[PDB]
Amino acid sequence: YFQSMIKFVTTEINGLTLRGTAHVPDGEPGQQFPTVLMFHGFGAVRDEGFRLFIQMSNRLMENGIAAVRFDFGCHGESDGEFEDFTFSQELNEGSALIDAVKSMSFVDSTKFSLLGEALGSVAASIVAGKRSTELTSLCMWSPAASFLDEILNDHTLQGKTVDNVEKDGYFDFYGLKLGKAFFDDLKNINIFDNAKKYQGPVKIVYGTNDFIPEKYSHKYMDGYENGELVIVQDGDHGWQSVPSRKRILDETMKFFRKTLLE
Amino acid sequence: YFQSMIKFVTTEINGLTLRGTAHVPDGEPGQQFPTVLMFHGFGAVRDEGFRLFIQMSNRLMENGIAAVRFDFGCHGESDGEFEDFTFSQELNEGSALIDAVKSMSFVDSTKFSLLGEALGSVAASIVAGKRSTELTSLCMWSPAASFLDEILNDHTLQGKTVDNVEKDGYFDFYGLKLGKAFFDDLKNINIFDNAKKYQGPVKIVYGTNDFIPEKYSHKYMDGYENGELVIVQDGDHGWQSVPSRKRILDETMKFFRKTLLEA
Ligand SMILES: [Ca+2]
Ligand SMILES: [Ca+2]
Ligand SMILES: [Ca+2]
Ligand SMILES: [Ca+2]
Ligand SMILES: [Ca+2]
């Protein structure tokens, strides 16, 4: 019998090494656990903001659910330059990470779910529709499903103009160079028609102080046969208040207990 | 022969597992390399913001300098609750990390330096002064040396009031609880009298848009026998523009080439 452990994991997808962390519950040798794979947001890292995914991972681990989270390609400690990042490759990696994680010794291939934050929720929704028979459930926090509308119609990315990409040669995201390839690839992305292909249990948690409009969470619900939408009064995009951090962890543990343990 | 590699490392300090990443250059079996140990800022993680420490780590690694960076206790993936965090224990961990990292198999303990960002620069400056023979050189980005003055004199932590910590039991830092122990421990901290004990090469990089007042960088320089201050026009606290990111990486590689590869 081995106590719980935190270990570091890697995988190779399309020639990039993706680097991640796994939180494995207490158990006997060779035990396979229900597992949540977590997708971080745009230009974020696998910890997410202010220990958010770390706290969620430990909460799951203490309750018998393994938690795995990788840096996407061109993010965090994974290989790849942000200038080469495209959302299509994030989607390819998210699908490939299902098989990478289900191959791990401690993961029950039949009790496996996705959790997302922000753009990671958008990726999770699309991967879930394309790999619907792989997922026991799907949980989406603060989904950034407005990102196509904002960039393509309002010509901004998180409020900053995208109209100087040709003049500058890049878009400046907090000191990272985001390339033209990202913007050229946006025409290939479909969120909601792909997302409605997943008809397992879905939970969406939206905070009223999120800068993403609430209507995008309702649009997801319009397409889900088994959706639940929780509106957290005065929650924000990253669950960056003490009360809303407790709320997001509790609501999510409740959902994964119901769908992966009960 | 071995190509460069990224490996994950852990060490135990005062009952907490601290978790870190090491970037090891290309080399022969058992080769040892000049090494930079990096200290992140307050409530940050070992990647620092927007890949900052990752980019610096890879730049060093590509040039034959190993880079090591841990989450401090109560930060990132390391053990410890933020409610229990104190700066004194950060200083103790920084001291213990010098010893743990100097014993790593790929580290040349005779060519070993610290790099800091923000509060990590303050920690680096104090540890460097207390362990004045241990470091080949010291580089500080955007040192947050105002933090005691801000909390103790202006009664704010990054602009938010600290006056309710005793009544309410904690301070809310972006969803994390920061306990009274942190605030009670501030009286134990001395920055500048400790920092001036280090007499090796020091480089400070300050951006004109940093919210930390420039005067604090001059106070450090006033106590350093062998200091250099670079002032980056339009640089900010976290080096969060493409031009200022290029500048900070280039200036720091230049300093570590001089102090770790050419000396
Ligand atoms: Ca246990
Ligand atoms: Ca593979
Ligand atoms: Ca690789
Ligand atoms: Ca090489
Ligand atoms: Ca431990």
Residue numbers in the entry:
A (entry chain B): -3 to 258
B (entry chain A): -3 to 259
Wording from the paper:
Here, we report the crystal structure and biochemical characterization of a feruloyl esterase (LbFAE) from Lentilactobacillus buchneri, a LAB strain that has been used as a silage additive.
Wild-type crystals grew as either triclinic (P1) or tetragonal (P43212) crystals under identical crystallization conditions, whereas crystals of the S114A variant were isomorphous with the P43212 crystal form despite being produced under different conditions. The unliganded wild-type and S114A structures do not reveal significant conformational changes compared with the FA-bound wild-type model, which suggests that binding of substrate, and release of product, may not require major structural rearrangements.
